[PDB]
Design a protein around this nucleic acid. Structure first.
Lengths: 200, 87, 154, 132, 164, 89, 53, 24
RNA sequence: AUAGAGUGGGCUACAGGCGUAUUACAUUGGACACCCACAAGUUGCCAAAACUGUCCGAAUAUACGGAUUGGAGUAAAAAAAAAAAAUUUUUUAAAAUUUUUUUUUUUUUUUGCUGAAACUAGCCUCCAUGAAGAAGGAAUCGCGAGUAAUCGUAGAUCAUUAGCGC
């Protein structure tokens, strides 16, 4: 597995090798989290748990920055056929929520899908409201899964975060109950502008 | 203007067919066509072939004689009939 | 109920007329109206811990999405010191962003006035009164002066 | 206590200064406040601004003829933030970094009783004392 | 089952006001129970007199005849509008209305009239058979109003169809 | 991100970089010379070096002034046909 | 890259199929022949042809 | 030209970003 | 003939000089996305500056600016029906599909535009060449609140031409 990782890292003029090594790691980690192949020389000892965390998920769904020349026109008249997220290989392989390979029938058989059979690669993605390239701000998902909204910074933890900013020197001073309620009503749960207003 | 009908030269063509009594372009490659051709309008385009033709173009005060050669084939004839603002 | 004429004509070079009142409705929910531009707005105030604050359907922090404009929304509410306990239901029309903010601020002020008489100005007693919020009841009905029927001429 | 908001808002409006969003200048001046924090604890911000502006108050104005005139202190604030900002554009166009750094370093130096704002400031103080 | 809408256009508010009042007199006369003895009246709460604002447009002019590009002046057209609402169930009084507005001439004032109404529809028996519910009232006729000697008492009259 | 070539304009610049594979957010201090050989080969697949084109347009408007045509005497005169400071001659 | 929602175009004619969601009603209008009754004939034929679906 | 030819801004100056409605 | 037509110019020429405007000389900015943000403006629906994200700061004349000049008028996306079906791509072990390959279909845009004719002398779109210009002396003008400036927007005459005019 470090075999394949060092196979990928070795060269920078045959890229197909590198990306294929990457997704080989992806499926092998999915297989290891499945518990399909236990080694014959290993102890009775539980395998390391596979967690995939994906910040800003829907960049795997918006159009990319890479484009191509279309085959029709001359290069002189070159409008850009911009390449899409499904047209990449690696991010298409990184579509874990739409992947079947966390819902492994091998892990549905050997772990049984039971509460004692925790044998699936637990995968979590979060995506933002500020895409740097035009991704949809919602995810129309065909594959069943559980969605959890992140609630905003409620009043108590805004007061606590302001106290922490009063600790770290970002602030000059403590906040009133009035100004804490004011900031809670102001940023609406936006963390980054709550950080921005901290001197005020 | 190539789209939907690219060429307009009707009165020039009437004079060209008047020239075309023995050869439009020296079919009898070119020999200067000594009979003068004197148009009365310069909005006309120039059609491929039409070489070695003595064209007399109007400037608003006279008729300007210019021999056509191979380069001026994709042009409109009014480009060769100026108002002479030299200085 | 006995309401009266509250309106003003404060501006210079162009007048104004917000003939709309603020009043409490029998649902326990007061309604009020406010414009400070020709762009205009209305409010509807429920004492509640429900959805909180709302203009134009959406939660406020994405619609208005400059922070300074957000405290221009909250400024009569922050001046009141009665922030949390009311559901804020409101509608707006027209204009540009912080004009909508200060308009919806005036409307929220009016609804808060009929909720509590002494904080802000009203027409309950002859169209006069004084609280901290009585200053921003009467709207600032200045509009743009008209683009001059005449010349640059320079 | 509200004079903090007054001086800051006059700083904002004078920082607007060409036609644009006062949102643009407002985020610019708040960036100057945070850059003042960063350079100040690098090598305590409303504090240093209030000290800088109270260091910069021209109490008696003079009118040329030379005649001194008493001045309502809100225009003292208003001239004050003005002289700060034209000195800021002097330094920043000489640096031609952003403006936020330039207004930050100028609010530090006018806090430290130093800089061309302080120079102009106390010469017109003494020249108000001259021509009585 | 007939619905009538009368729209009215004017320049002086005096004339469109008199026009609105006199046609209101005509409607209330036209469905008036003048005597009790027959007793299907339509003062249903559809009925209105909706007033309307206008189309704000300013059209300015040079004051001077020649050079005079300083010399501007603003000018302006006004159109004042009302709509008159009623509906009824028998046609003979509707014809009394249309002949009433045929007689009384009104000065400077346009009459545009909308007459959505029910009218029965023949079908070829094939589509009735292959039927075997929504509104679908879609005729919306259209007529010209100018260039043939008419100063615009035009009547437009969309139709509503019924074939269950 | 070759927004940086000089003998060509910008759209063809990002075209040639895309035609050998250089995306945005790459600097000239980050291209290995194999790709330089590739992009040069693609330059003689494209058209080359706008001074070669400036020689080319020199015989192009030489052709136009060889036609006894008034745009030819524009180009020997410097008059706008739509700053006689620059000319194509 | 901007266009009005109400195209309200011209240089053409049609039967103008449209629906009104406010009152749950479809709307078709007349435009081809000069007289109103000829248009009533055309749209009545269009209504019959509409029911062939 | 305020970026008249190639922008998402100067083409509202040249009246093209507003695509011309089909009329005659 | 100081009268009318007809055809084509000219009314727009170009050492100099002057008046009026616009656009910049950047970073408070350029670009690109965003939601395609909210208007004047529903009467008988539609923006931009900005806000949020990302790229850029070498006297580079910068990825600022956009004048002159050549050249060319070109791409597709959507999805339907049948036959078959479990194939394409690397290194020395892997990868993308369970949809690959055939026939019929089919929309919606696309077409340089408008005019009879766009060389002078229109306008549009896209390439390419990328000028001066790094804030302007003497001198001086205009204007103190929704004002200057900046930003669009829509109306006129108009076949189209207003980008800057009003």
């Amino acid at each position: 597995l470090q075999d394949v990782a060092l196979r990928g890292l070795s060269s920078d003029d045959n890229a197909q090798l590198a990306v294929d090594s990457a997704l080989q790691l992806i499926r092998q980690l999915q297989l290891l989290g499945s518990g399909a192949a236990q080694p014959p020389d290993s102890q009775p000892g539980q395998p390391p748990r596979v967690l995939f965390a994906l910040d800003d998920y829907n960049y795997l769904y918006g159009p990319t920055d890479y484009g191509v020349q279309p085959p029709s026109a001359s290069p002189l008249q070159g409008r850009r056929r911009v390449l899409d997220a499904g047209e990449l290989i690696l991010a298409r392989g990184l579509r874990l929520l739409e992947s079947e390979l966390g819902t492994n029938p091998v892990a549905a058989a050997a772990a049984g899908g039971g509460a004692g059979g925790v044998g699936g690669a637990v995968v979590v993605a979060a995506t933002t409201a500020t895409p740097a390239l035009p991704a949809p701000r919602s995810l129309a998902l065909e594959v069943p899964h559980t969605v959890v909204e992140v609630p905003g910074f409620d009043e108590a933890e805004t007061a606590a975060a302001l106290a922490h900013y009063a600790a770290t020197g970002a602030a000059t001073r403590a906040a009133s109950a009035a100004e804490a309620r004011h900031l809670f009503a102001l940023t609406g749960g936006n963390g980054r502008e709550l950080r921005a207003k901290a001197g005020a | 203007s190539t789209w939907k009908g690219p060429y307009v030269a009707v009165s020039l063509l009437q004079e060209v067919v008047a020239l075309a009594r023995k050869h439009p372009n020296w079919w009898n490659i070119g020999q200067k066509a000594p009979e003068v051709i004197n148009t009365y309008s310069r909005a006309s385009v120039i059609l491929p072939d039409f070489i070695a033709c003595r064209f007399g173009v109007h400037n608003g005060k006279s008729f300007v004689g210019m021999e056509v050669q191979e380069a001026m084939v994709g042009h409109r004839l009014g480009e060769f009939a100026p108002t002479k603002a030299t200085v | 109920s006995g309401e009266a004429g509250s309106g003003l004509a404060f501006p210079a070079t162009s007048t104004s007329p917000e003939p709309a009142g603020p009043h409490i409705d029998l649902t326990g929910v007061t309604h009020a109206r406010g414009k400070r531009k020709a762009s205009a707005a209305s409010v509807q105030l429920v004492p509640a811990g429900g959805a909180g604050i709302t203009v134009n359907g959406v939660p406020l922090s994405s619609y208005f999405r400059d922070p300074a404009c957000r405290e221009k929304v909250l400024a009569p509410l922050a001046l009141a010191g009665a922030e949390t306990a009311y559901d804020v239901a409101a509608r707006v029309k027209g204009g540009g962003m912080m004009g909508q903010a200060q308009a919806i601020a005036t409307a929220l002020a009016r609804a808060l006035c009929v909720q509590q008489p002494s904080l802000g100005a009203t027409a309950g007693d002859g169209g006069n009164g004084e609280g901290p919020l009585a200053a921003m009841t009467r709207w600032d009905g200045r509009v743009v002066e008209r683009q001059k029927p005449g010349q640059a001429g320079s | 206590x509200x004079x903090x908001x007054x001086x800051x808002x006059x700083x904002x409006x004078x920082x607007x200064x060409x036609x644009x969003x006062x949102x643009x200048x407002x985020x610019x001046x708040x960036x100057x406040x945070x850059x003042x924090x960063x350079x100040x604890x690098x090598x305590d911000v409303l504090e240093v601004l209030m000290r800088a502006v109270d260091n910069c108050k021209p109490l008696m104005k003079v009118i040329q003829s030379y005649q001194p005139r008493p001045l309502n202190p809100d225009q003292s604030t208003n001239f004050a933030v003005k002289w700060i900002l034209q000195a800021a554009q002097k330094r920043r166009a000489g640096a031609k970094a952003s403006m936020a750094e330039a207004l930050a370093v100028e609010l530090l130096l006018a806090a430290q009783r130093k800089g061309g704002a302080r120079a102009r400031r106390d010469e017109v103080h003494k020249l108000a004392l001259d021509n009585r | 089952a007939y619905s009538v809408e009368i729209a009215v256009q004017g320049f002086e508010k005096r004339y469109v006001d008199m026009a609105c009042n006199t046609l209101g007199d005509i409607i209330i006369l036209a469905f008036a129970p003048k005597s009790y003895a027959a007793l299907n009246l339509a003062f249903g709460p559809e009925r209105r007199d909706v007033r309307l604002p206008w189309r704000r447009t300013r059209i300015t002019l040079i004051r001077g005849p020649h050079i005079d590009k300083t010399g501007m002046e603003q000018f302006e057209r006004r159109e004042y509008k009302s709509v008159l609402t009623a509906a009824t169930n028998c046609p003979q009084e509707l014809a009394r209305l249309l002949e009433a507005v045929k007689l009384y001439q009104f000065t400077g004032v346009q009459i545009k009239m909308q007459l959505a109404s029910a009218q029965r529809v023949d079908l070829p028996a094939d589509v009735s058979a292959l039927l075997r519910x929504x509104x679908x009232x879609x005729x919306x006729x259209x007529x010209x109003x100018x260039x043939x000697x008419x100063x615009x008492x035009x009547x437009x009259x969309x139709x509503x169809x019924x074939x269950x | 991100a070759l927004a940086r070539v000089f003998g060509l304009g910008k759209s063809t610049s990002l075209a040639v970089s895309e035609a050998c594979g250089i995306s945005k957010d790459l600097k000239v201090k980050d291209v290995k010379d194999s790709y330089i050989q590739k992009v040069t080969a693609y330059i003689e697949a494209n058209f080359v070096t706008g001074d070669t084109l400036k020689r080319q347009v020199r015989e192009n408007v030489l052709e136009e002034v060889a036609i006894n045509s008034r745009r030819g005497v524009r180009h020997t005169l410097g008059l706008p046909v739509s700053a006689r400071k620059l000319r194509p001659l | 890259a901007a266009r009005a929602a109400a195209n309200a175009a011209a240089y053409p004619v049609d039967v103008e199929h449209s629906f009104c969601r406010r009152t749950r009603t479809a709307a078709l209008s007349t435009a081809r022949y000069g007289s109103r009754e000829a248009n009533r004939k055309l749209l009545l034929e269009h209504y019959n042809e509409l029911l062939r679906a | 030209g305020k970026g008249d030819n190639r922008t998402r801004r100067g083409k509202i100056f040249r009246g093209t970003y507003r695509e011309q409605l089909p009329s005659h």
